[PDB]
Amino acid sequence: RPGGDTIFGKIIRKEIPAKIIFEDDRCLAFHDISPQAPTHFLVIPKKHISQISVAEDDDESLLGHLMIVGKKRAADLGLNKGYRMVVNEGSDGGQSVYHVHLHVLGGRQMHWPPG
Amino acid sequence: GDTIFGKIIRKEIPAKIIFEDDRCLAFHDISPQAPTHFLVIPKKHISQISVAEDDDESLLGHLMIVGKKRAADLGLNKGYRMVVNEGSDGGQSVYHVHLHVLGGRQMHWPPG
Ligand SMILES: [Cl-]
Numbered sequence: 001r002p003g004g005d006t007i008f009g010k011i012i013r014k015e016i017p018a019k020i021i022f023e024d025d026r027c028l029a030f031h032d033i034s035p036q037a038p039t040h041f042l043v044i045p046k047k048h049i050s051q052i053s054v055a056e057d058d059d060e061s062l063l064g065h066l067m068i069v070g071k072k073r074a075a076d077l078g079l080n081k082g083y084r085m086v087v088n089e090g091s092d093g094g095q096s097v098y099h100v101h102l103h104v105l106g107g108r109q110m111h112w113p114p115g
Numbered sequence: 116g117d118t119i120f121g122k123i124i125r126k127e128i129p130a131k132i133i134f135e136d137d138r139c140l141a142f143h144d145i146s147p148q149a150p151t152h153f154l155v156i157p158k159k160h161i162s163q164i165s166v167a168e169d170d171d172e173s174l175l176g177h178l179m180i181v182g183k184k185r186a187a188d189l190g191l192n193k194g195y196r197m198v199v200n201e202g203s204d205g206g207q208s209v210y211h212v213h214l215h216v217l218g219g220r221q222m223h224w225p226p227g
Pocket residue numbers: 200206207208209
């Protein structure tokens with residue numbers, strides 16, 4: 001099945017419910033069920049890429065699209081004071097699901113370091 | 116409005132440069148928050164991700180591909196975290212778009 005069988009692949013195919021914000025032919029934005037900020041959503045490609053460390057050179061446009069969609073959805077959600085975008089890679093990055101995802105967090109002051 | 120990152124791109128002040136191409140520059144952060152902490156920045160002056168244009172999409176992806184390749188070159192085989200900060204709530208320190216790449220330790224949750 002297209003997208004794979006991680007929870008994110010299932011969400012892409014409407015097999016597991018999610019609170020969807022935005023969808024286009026390349027990606028999907030939906031709210032994180034364990035939010036770490038007052039607003040916390042994910043932008044994922046529909047194409048299955050397990051982790052950023054294995055993304056291909058020709059995935060540049062798609063990865064950039066995640067960020068453009070993230071910033072547009074953040075504006076649509078009224079995050080007018082700003083936000084933080086995060087991609088986790090692997091164990092040290094805290095990556096929970098092996099399907100590439102961009103976190104977008106806002107609605108409060110984010111702190112430094114970023115974890 | 117120019118920034119300190121513009122000065123770094125122009126080679127007017129030093130930084131520990133890791134990689135360069137025709138459209139971006141990667142260099143170690145002067146205030147590292149992990150054993151490895153570097154930045155990938157576009158040479159184009161985009162002040163913040165919120166004003167990035169649609170035509171900038173593949174350039175932004177290029178920052179991430181460069182970041183992941185440099186992370187591998189720097190031995191971050193256990194993983195890493197990529198961060199883009201926007202505005203005051205995001206903690207953005209310089210108004211020139213920059214991708215942070217942090218690793219060499221366990222990164223924690225929440226991410227700030
Ligand atoms: Cl910053």
